[PDB]
Every structure is written in C-alpha cells, then in structure tokens.
Amino acid sequence: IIGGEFTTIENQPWFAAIYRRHRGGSVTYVCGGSLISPCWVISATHCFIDYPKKEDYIVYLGRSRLNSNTQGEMKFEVENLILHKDYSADTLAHHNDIALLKIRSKEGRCAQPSRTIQTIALPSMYNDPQFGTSCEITGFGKEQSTDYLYPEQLKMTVVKLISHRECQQPHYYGSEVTTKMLCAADPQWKTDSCQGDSGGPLVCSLQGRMTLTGIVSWGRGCALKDKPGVYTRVSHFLPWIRSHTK
Numbered sequence: 001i002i003g004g005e006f007t008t009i010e011n012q013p014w015f016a017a018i019y020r021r022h023r024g025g026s027v028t029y030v031c032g033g034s035l036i037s038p039c040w041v042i043s044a045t046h047c048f049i050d051y052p053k054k055e056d057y058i059v060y061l062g063r064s065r066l067n068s069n070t071q072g073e074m075k076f077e078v079e080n081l082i083l084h085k086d087y088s089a090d091t092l093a094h095h096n097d098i099a100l101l102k103i104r105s106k107e108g109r110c111a112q113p114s115r116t117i118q119t120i121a122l123p124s125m126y127n128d129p130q131f132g133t134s135c136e137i138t139g140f141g142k143e144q145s146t147d148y149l150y151p152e153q154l155k156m157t158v159v160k161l162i163s164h165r166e167c168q169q170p171h172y173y174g175s176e177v178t179t180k181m182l183c184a185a186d187p188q189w190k191t192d193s194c195q196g197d198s199g200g201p202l203v204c205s206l207q208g209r210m211t212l213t214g215i216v217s218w219g220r221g222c223a224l225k226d227k228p229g230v231y232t233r234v235s236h237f238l239p240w241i242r243s244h245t246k
C-alpha cells in the first residue's frame, strides 16, 4: 500500500496472509486474501498460477505483522487450491483473476471465528457501489514502487471507485479494462495498492453493509496519474464462487 496508514488485524479480521514454503524450508510472503467462510479464503489466481502445489502454501488468519506470531493468530495449510479455469494475463490486464483456498489446521479444522478472525460478506448480483464511492484496501504490499522489501506492519488506505467510461479513456486504460473489472484510485494520485497487495480485499460499505466488492488485481505502476488500481469485480463471479465452495 502506497501512502495510507499502518493498521492491525482487529480492524481487518477477514484479512488472510498467504506465504509460500520454498525447497530448503524458507518461507516468503506471496499475496493477501479474504476469509469468505470458516473453510474458505478468496484471493487472485495470478498469485498462485506459477506455483500451483497446494502443499507449499501457509495461510494465517489474525496476523498483524509479516514476521510476528500475533496473539490469537491461527495457522493453516491448503486442503484445496482452486484456480479459475479461464484465468489469463495480457501485458497489463489480468482476466478472471480469482482463486479459492480451502483451509485446514493440522488437526483438520477450519477457522474458529474470534475478535481478530471474522468472515467478509460477498456482494449481491448487479448491485455494486456507484462511481465516487470511497472504499478501503488492505495489504502487506510495497510502500513505494522502488522498495524491494514489504512493510513489517499491515497497512490500509481509502480510494474512490472510478466509472468504466472514465477508466476506458485513452490516457487511462482504453479498451484494456473490461466490465468484469472495477477501477479505483485517489483523485490526487498519492495513495494506491501496489505489488504484494494482490489477492487482497477492496471492501466497500454499501447500504450499511461491509462487502467484498473487489480483489486487488492489476495496475500500471503504483499511484501513477491517470492509472487507477484495477480490481476483480466479485459480483460477476458469484455463480463461480457458489459452485466451487458447494
């Protein structure tokens, strides 16, 4: 996250921290995720497509820091890694950038909801917020494009949704951004999501309800003028999520 503020897991209890085990036993951060039910974490397929072995991943719930065992945190393995069969990448745009991770403790249990571990509600079909609506993003992603390290402490920011017609303008993304994608940015281009925030939530309060409106997917640079953050529009994927969690 570029700009914004440092936060803790109690303010974002649906936030899942996803890591990968490498050969030799070292563990590194991959992407964010969101708890949608006790056994299921939703993320972006582009985070896993190059390393599709479920046994390699570690998922934490209730974790506030990248290298700290936050009190009350829960560690899990991936029982089922589901990638979207029509996922594809263009030079900029990612298509069908959505993934599901079925989680399991070493005892074979799913998440136990607590003050720091809670689910996030899915959106309803054809009911996304209007352009100009303020929404929040969370992640352990880069603080600056030139950084190679990720922040130790979890961050958050607030951005505004951008219309499809504004996002399709020539100086923005043209025809490369589609109706299955949602644009969101800072009107002053100072805060945004960035590399490492992928797979993480775009949470919008709509009609009084906190909703998983988007999943961090792609963008040209980070916090660049006329280059919004692009998110998977979760409301389009409700039949796919239902079928793969049944």
Ligand SMILES: N=C(N)c1ccc2cc(C#Cc3ccc4c(c3)CCNC4)ccc2c1
Pocket: 046, 047, 049, 050, 192, 193, 194, 195, 196, 197, 198, 216, 217, 218, 219, 220, 221, 222, 223, 227, 228, 229, 230
């Ligand atoms: N401006 C943004 N909001 C934004 C949002 C998401 C981003 C995501 C990345 C990235 C990445 C990345 C890095 C490594 C690999 C993949 C993707 C996909 C498959 N191969 C590995 C970089 C900049 C990003 C910028």
